[PDB]
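lol ok so funny story. i was supposed to be doing the assay writeup but got distracted and ended up predicting the structure for this chain instead. priorities right. anyway since i did it might as well share w the group, maybe its usefull for someone
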Amino acid sequence: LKPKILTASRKIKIKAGFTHNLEVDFIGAPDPTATWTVGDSGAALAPELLVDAKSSTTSIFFPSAKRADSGNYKLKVKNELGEDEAIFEVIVQ
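and the output, tada:
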């Protein structure tokens, strides 16, 4: 079952020293693989916030978001031969 990621994916206006709740969804299986990256063509995100993910979906946290968090949260999921991806430009104010 290829991953059908429908998460709108666009941007994320978070504030500094704030908490965000990133959400996403994708029908991938069996047991697909979703990676939460941060643009940069190789950069990733997680240790600068919280992150969660499910086989047919995924969502990550930003309870510790700050000006630095200002990055391009790019997530890419897959599943054997099915592949999907959602771009999330996250900024902080």
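The domain at 1-93 is CATH 2.60.40.10 (Immunoglobulin-like). The two ends are 39 Å apart (CA to CA).
back to the writeup now i swear
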